[PDB]
Enzyme design. Structure first.
Site, PDB file in Angstrom:
ATOM      1  N   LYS A   1       0.841  -1.165   0.000  1.00 13.21           N
ATOM      2  CA  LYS A   1       0.000   0.000   0.000  1.00 13.21           C
ATOM      3  C   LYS A   1       0.870   1.206   0.000  1.00 13.21           C
ATOM      4  O   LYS A   1       1.959   1.192   0.566  1.00 13.21           O
ATOM      5  CB  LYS A   1      -0.942   0.026   1.184  1.00 13.21           C
ATOM      6  CG  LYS A   1      -2.106   0.973   0.964  1.00 13.21           C
ATOM      7  CD  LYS A   1      -3.001   0.452  -0.144  1.00 13.21           C
ATOM      8  CE  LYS A   1      -4.409   0.965  -0.023  1.00 13.21           C
ATOM      9  NZ  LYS A   1      -5.390  -0.062  -0.470  1.00 13.21           N
TER      10      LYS A   1
ATOM     11  N   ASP B   1      -7.118   3.885  -5.537  1.00 17.58           N
ATOM     12  CA  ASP B   1      -7.827   3.868  -4.279  1.00 17.58           C
ATOM     13  C   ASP B   1      -8.229   5.255  -3.969  1.00 17.58           C
ATOM     14  O   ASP B   1      -8.160   6.130  -4.838  1.00 17.58           O
ATOM     15  CB  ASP B   1      -6.944   3.326  -3.159  1.00 17.58           C
ATOM     16  CG  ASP B   1      -7.735   2.586  -2.110  1.00 17.58           C
ATOM     17  OD1 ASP B   1      -8.458   3.249  -1.331  1.00 17.58           O
ATOM     18  OD2 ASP B   1      -7.646   1.339  -2.070  1.00 17.58           O
TER      19      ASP B   1
END
Lengths: 427, 427, 427, 427
Positions: free
Chosen positions: A125, A165
């Site tokens: 991430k 995202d």
């Protein structure tokens, strides 16, 4: 498990300052006892202890210039958490709230979610405390370019694959890709559209319905938020029989009993999100409904809870208004939308079924890993199911009944432990 | 468009010394008005201005030794023009006439052609003023090795993929590949057989016939040249109903009314090309026909014109003998075989249909990108069609009628602009 | 030499469109007969033929955004001409007149100049048709960054070292270096201050004076231009005895008999250059002198000619006003400030001494290669001398008398041929 | 400065959880007002804001096996803080207390210290929460190997150079180097012996003495700790006239009035440190002196304070016992051995001279950058001086009097700002 309980305790101490991360660890590991107990060889190689530490973490300075020639500097992150099963894979989040604890919790979740897809992809991430909101396109471009001027070196096709995202839409990705293509000169294909997430979530609910000898047909669903994730749900729900009656924001939430089931009602969700106003009532203004100023939609009577907004959106108090409405279906779609206390409580509640975001929202990454329109809906639909069934079968094997939460953890974890065990003590 | 007209003018000035390149630009851009007009955001980011400049150009010294120990030195080129949609892809041309202007025009054409295939491949072109003619195999090997000793560093699987073209046959490619495998030690698979080109061309003509409610059956076709490109056409034409009656060379051209439709007639095309004599009459000598010394075949009465030889093979004068024979089908197969004046004229001629080489000859690269025998003919056939239909649909949308020339440009360009726009200001 | 004469002829043809480059080649090679004649082994390996072709050429698109968000696109160049003796070394020139012919001629000159320093450095040259004039600092930064985003890959410590030149000051270099450090993350030390050039030039003149049993003391010197190169000369001249009486611009030139020998007169040269007005008369306005509108200073009576402005600043006509003033010392300091016709003429003039820019201005690169204040002046002074003496000794050996032009060519060339001969047929 | 005061405030907030780092920032920046005020162009490019964020941060998992086959996992760090002036340079610290805040504060200090040496080296710092204490040699080797199996990729000759520090002795370095040589196969020379530190410190004191028209001869010095840093001081002090009377540990400190000035007394410092007992009294046991259980040596009457143990070793209370003993010389040798409150207080005390660790202990890195025995002592001695004089001259210029603290900050900072300003907005 004593091993399990210890590590948890150790993490709590050590990373007291990264709460989100601590929270995620407790939840996942807490579900792992039974397995660890049958695998004493795990402790011998300090498996849990390695797992909780990302393989590699990267923080970097991202200086950039705005349209006025004024310079701003933000922080970039890339957490390559676990690559036991395959190249890291994960999105980038651009929000002013982003920090290491947050990237860490997401990165950690991401490796479990990635493990469940059956795809061989690790978890990572990245992001920045940069806030695309209020920024010009040019300004996003410039920031993205600056961001990638560093990141490019840590990633690559069979190394680390970034995806989209929160804060990172097709535009950001396009801007980063161009910078990547310009620097490395290689330019692969797509350094990584949420209806997949939304759709997969609903596809999971079906498997749940079926397991429950139940039907989605004619169900009331309470959503939280009005973003891409709620929208994709509402859409599929509406198309599948059910209907949304709630959307929430930072200013409260609204109740719509006709249901948010009309081509037009829904399209407004797009309008509100693209209006940057971040106010749910705009909807209350639009379709002349009731909006509840500074309130959480969890006191409403509904067949299903489907939280698609933010984390710890559901604590204990909220969970008390829920079980007190005898809702049988609590379905996480947004990451940790429930405090670990809340959830346990629910997990505790005997008539209800609880689903974990990591399984539920595994829709997006699935597709991604997939790189027509229905060779898709098809697989997403199908895999979503196998994910449901797998989690179910696992919890059972370990004598937990229909615990979709534990089950998810056990399945994803099981794929990782094996890999790490096969690969030896290196990472 | 004023933006369009300006840039053209700027290019004309700036690169006055690279005529072929100027020519190509005018033609392509000249067709782009309508689109540019609907995309004012293009000018804001100097899109046209970036497009006309290759992303990167490489010229290099290629010293080599002949069979007599005598050393020769040539110039190598690699023009990586546009990689907006994917890794560069393009062939290498070994001819004594090769220079930057020529590589540039081909490279530029190549990105449009590559854009039309629907394949995600950019455009490039390379070559050398080296002349394989008269050279020993050993001598080609040595040259190829020298050539690749430099090129290897600029190319690679997901960077730049070379293919074959004029002067570069399977042999050259094999020799270069071996040098590549020896240096990098990687050795992928094929650093990049024209019947695909020839076939696709005919497959395109069909789509044209059909659009025209017409038939190939019993048509007279005039080819130019007798190389791989004519041969593959004649073959398919002959097999599809039509028949070739002309082939041209540097010494003139010949007329054959029986048609070049026999297993044997055609195979001679192979013999003449492999005989390095570069004289069409050898054919006139062979099958006892009429050969016209120092003449261009465009005064012959024919149903279809299919120029498969050289550039600007058809100027204005030639176009006047053509419209004056009321030929309804002028089909470019070789790159720019018509002066921009000639063409406009034709485009101007109301009963005729004009097809652009960039669309027409997109047969080869298609296949290439494809890395049985009929999973092939199949796709080539099919895609060739979609290419025809796409160009047609586009021209229309923009209110140009059945302009296969513009249409091709608009379609290929449209795929590129979008990409470049998504990727931002970097390249 | 017939070999020599041929190649020249071949170059003339082949690169007719790159005049500056052709000019440079003729001049250099034309001086090489005697040597080539004693080295028949050169022709055997096509030495001259390899030499005239740069080892590698790079052109690239440089898109950038101005302070108004408007996008501009320029062309970048890097000509790595000859690396026989060591890593390429050369500056970058940012001027709207820059093209391949120009980079090529400079690159070619640079390898000879680099050869003469005794330092083991090859020759290269780079630049862009970008014009720093009128641009904001931010805008230069952005351009420089864009420029280096591509160049970085072709250069490096022991590969290619860029330095400063026209348009590229310490600021540009600093901006490029930062981009380099940011990308590669390596950040060596200085990807490459003209008083060295200016000083070395004067230091060369001394060696000339001495060879001539002469003195600088009390000499009138005519400069052209008022840039860094004239200034550094005037300064040293003034400090050494002589004095400047001319400076020229695009608007003409001025005559100052008191001499430009005062702390203040000279410092104005700095003011005029930093004033971007590009007008010599500003000086005429300042120190109340005579300025000649739209004229070349070569009709003035002077002891020494020292052209420090632009190329072909001295053609034949100008040379006729010069020999007609019986000036004994014509000293090139700026690159090719004389037409090849002009020069020959002069070389032809029996009482005069002619020095070539490639030797004369080798001051800068010397220092550069040098990476206190007087360990410097010392070496520069000394090497400048050896360069003078070497060229002199060489011309003689070959029976040319005191031909500083040929001598320079012979010496620099001799160092290169040997290297290339030792390294075999590869480059 | 308002800019200065703001940033400080921002850092305080943002990194509340990294106290050491916050502390260091306040101290350094707090000294920077005057300069910032004269450089308004700094704010324009958010200079301070970029400076406080490390260019790049790396955290990594370091799993290793002990002699019993038991696996342990620690965290590795490498903070490449600022490379404006040259490749990063910094040591590695292996201590169980190590975390990001600590590596960050050291890394930040390191860039200022590195800036002061006049050497062109940036600042970095690395380490691990691994504790070499109690570990077998084999176990250190294995850990070191694991550590380098990741680090190797982030470092390199002209990128990042690690050196030794707390926990990292020649042995660790040797073990890491071997792993590096084995992996990269390059094996440069020394990936980076504290008497240099100790010596330089004393050499600095001399410059201070001299500035003060004073003498070291016959001075009482209070040290803290008994490690390599105190030892090297005591040694030089003893040899230079002065004598140590205090050493402290975690169990208190001891008083020796004869002075720790004998070949044997000192050599015990080596024995105690190599005895891993970490108890100062062992010394009290050895040479029969008074040891004060659980006390800090700052209540003793002494001419000089020279803290060589740990950070914030001197808070406010301790500073009150010091000024209350009218000690004129407080000399930091260990990093931040004083709370920012304490120091200010002292800086506040009018008769005393205060020196900053960053200047004082710049002895080690100097030498390092130096890669006989007295070409050394010589330079170290000399540079140590210039460092003292430079800091002094700077503080003055800015009207601060003899503020060796500010002066150090101003000088080191000044070298960095310039660089960053020249290199533009990239890092």
């Amino acid at each position: 498990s004593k091993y399990v309980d210890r590590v948890i305790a150790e993490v709590e101490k050590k990373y007291a300052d990264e709460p989100e991360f601590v929270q995620t660890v407790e939840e996942v590991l807490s579900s792992l006892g039974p397995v660890v107990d049958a695998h004493p060889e795990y402790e011998e190689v300090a498996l849990l202890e390695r797992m909780v530490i990302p393989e590699r973490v990267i923080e970097f300075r991202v200086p950039w210039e705005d349209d006025n020639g004024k310079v701003h500097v933000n922080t970039g992150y890339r957490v390559q958490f676990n690559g036991a099963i395959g190249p890291y894979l994960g999105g980038l989040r651009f929000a002013p709230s982003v920090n290491l604890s947050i990237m860490k919790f997401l990165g950690f979740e991401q490796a479990f979610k990635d493990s469940l897809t059956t795809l061989p992809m690790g978890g990572a991430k990245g992001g920045s405390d940069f806030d695309p909101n209020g920024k010009s396109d040019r300004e996003v471009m410039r920031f993205c370019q600056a961001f990638m001027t560093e990141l490019y070196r840590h990633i690559g096709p069979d190394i680390d694959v970034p995806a989209g995202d929160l804060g990172v839409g097709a535009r950001e990705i396009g801007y980063m890709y161009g910078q990547y293509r310009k620097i490395v000169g290689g330019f692969y294909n797509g350094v990584l559209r949420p209806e997949a997430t939304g759709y997969g979530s609903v596809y999971y609910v079906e498997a749940v319905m079926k397991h429950e000898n139940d039907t989605l047909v004619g169900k009331t669903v309470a959503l939280a938020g009005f973003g891409n994730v709620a929208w994709g749900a509402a859409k599929k729900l509406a198309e599948l029989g059910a209907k949304a009656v709630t959307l929430s924001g930072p200013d409260g939430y609204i109740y719509d009993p006709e249901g948010i089931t009309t081509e037009e009602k829904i399209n407004y969700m797009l309008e509100m999100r693209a209006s940057g106003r971040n106010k749910v009532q705009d909807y209350a203004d639009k379709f002349g409904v009731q909006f509840f100023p500074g309130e959480k939609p969890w006191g409403q009577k509904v067949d299903i809870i489907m939280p698609c907004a933010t984390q710890n959106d559901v604590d204990l108090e909220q969970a008390k208004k829920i079980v007190a409405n005898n809702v049988k279906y609590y379905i996480e779609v947004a990451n940790m939308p429930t405090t670990n206390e809340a959830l346990r409580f629910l997990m505790q509640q005997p008539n209800m079924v609880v689903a974990p975001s990591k399984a539920v929202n595994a829709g997006g990454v699935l597709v991604v890993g997939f790189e027509t329109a229905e060779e898709v809906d098809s697989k997403l639909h199908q895999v979503m199911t196998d994910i449901h069934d797998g989690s179910a079968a696992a919890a059972e094997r370990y004598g937990l009944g229909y615990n979709l939460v534990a089950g998810a953890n056990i399945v994803g974890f099981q794929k990782i432990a094996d890999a790490m065990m096969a690969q030896g003590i290196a990472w």
